[PDB]
Structure 1
Amino acid sequence: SSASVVFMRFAPPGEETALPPRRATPGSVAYDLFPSEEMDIEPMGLAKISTGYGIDKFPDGCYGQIVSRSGMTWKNNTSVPTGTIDVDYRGELKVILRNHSAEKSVPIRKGTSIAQLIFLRYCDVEEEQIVYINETTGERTIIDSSSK
């Protein structure tokens, strides 16, 4: 279970949907994400693209980070401004994609990947304290504290 992922398909079986998150090969860090629908992102535009899938099970100690693909960033003048997926998120992954071109539109197509997903190890903090420190004496005052 330590290195296993379960993706949740939103569309009922039998219905046309996006290509599933596909391992990027050659390579080992990313999954390619695909769009459910086709569109053209206008110059300076910001799009929210549905991928047809959610993460049902994350690998242990990992959350998901949606990142831009190098090719499209350079070729289509794009970026992925946000992409932090919490371990409790059950909804459908949606890629936020910005077109930085003042002249060209970005083609979003069924069989072509729009972004990558990486499973990064993070710390799920168990203990937290908020402290105020006297800048002259070094004396500490606990503001508040909590356990998870």
Structure 2
Amino acid sequence: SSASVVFMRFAPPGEETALPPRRATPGSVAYDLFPSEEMDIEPMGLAKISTGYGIDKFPDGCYGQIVSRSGMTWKNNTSVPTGTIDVDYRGELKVILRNHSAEKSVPIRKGTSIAQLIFLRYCDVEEEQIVYINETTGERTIIDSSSKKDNKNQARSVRGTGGFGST
């Protein structure tokens, strides 16, 4: 089960919630996220929209990146300015959507997907070093070095449901 994902639905079974993440076509690279509640983003506004789902299990070597959908961007003059989901995040996925229109509001509706989640491959660094390289001599001075187990320069040990500048 290498190319597998487990989404966690925050609402109990039988309770009403957002439409589940879905892949629009067989070659779609991302899951369309839907809003749990409806709203209208005011001109020049910034919204944090709940999707009703979290990620219980990520595919191996991947993290989740929320990116904009081209239709929502172009037709509604928006952007998704952030969307990096850490692999220890246990909370609900929230979409940050910016309205760039000075006169029009953006409709957020239950049947229409607001952004998409892609599972990107990244390197979870095991070893790191900070070096100083002398521009004139070429001499390398090791300033510091750490292994992932060292948990050096850490904000906290457990992310939990903490996000949005929680560190």
TM range (shorter): over 0.9
Residues 29-70 of structure 1: CA deviation (Å, up to 9, x unaligned): 110000000000011000000000000000010001000000
State the alpha-carbon separation in 2 of the partners of residues 35 and 28 from structure 1. 20
Residues 55-102 of structure 1: CA deviation (Å, up to 9, x unaligned): 000001000100000011110001000000011111000000000011
State the alpha-carbon separation in 2 of the partners of residues 96 and 38 from structure 1. 14
1:12 CA displacement: 1.0
1:26 CA displacement: 4.5
| Aligned Cα root-mean-square deviation (Å) | 0.8
* TM-score relative to the length of structure 1: 0.97
Q: Secondary structure in 1 aligned to 2:19?
A: coil
1:136 CA displacement: 1.0
Residues 77-131 of structure 1: CA deviation (Å, up to 9, x unaligned): 0100000001111100000000001111111001110000000000111110000
Instruction: Point out where structure 1 has 5 or more consecutive residues left out of the alignment.
Output: none
Q: Sequence identity of aligned pairs in percent?
A: 100
Q: Secondary structure in 1 aligned to 2:20?
A: coil
1:27 CA displacement: 2.6
State the alpha-carbon separation in 2 of the partners of residues 26 and 97 from structure 1. 26
What is the count of residue pairs matched by the alignment? 147
Residues 9-32 of structure 1: CA deviation (Å, up to 9, x unaligned): 101112111011111215331100
State the alpha-carbon separation in 2 of the partners of residues 85 and 24 from structure 1. 21
State the alpha-carbon separation in 2 of the partners of residues 26 and 61 from structure 1. 22
Normalized per residue, the structure richer in strand is 1
Matches within 5 A, 1:90-109: 90-109=90-109
Q: Secondary structure in 2 aligned to 1:22?
A: coil
Q: Where in structure 1 do 4 or more consecutive aligned residues deviate above 4 Å?
A: none
| Residue of structure 1 in register with 2:127 after alignment | 127
* TM-score relative to the length of structure 2: 0.86
Instruction: Point out where structure 2 has 5 or more consecutive residues left out of the alignment.
Output: 148-167
State the alpha-carbon separation in 2 of the partners of residues 46 and 108 from structure 1. 12
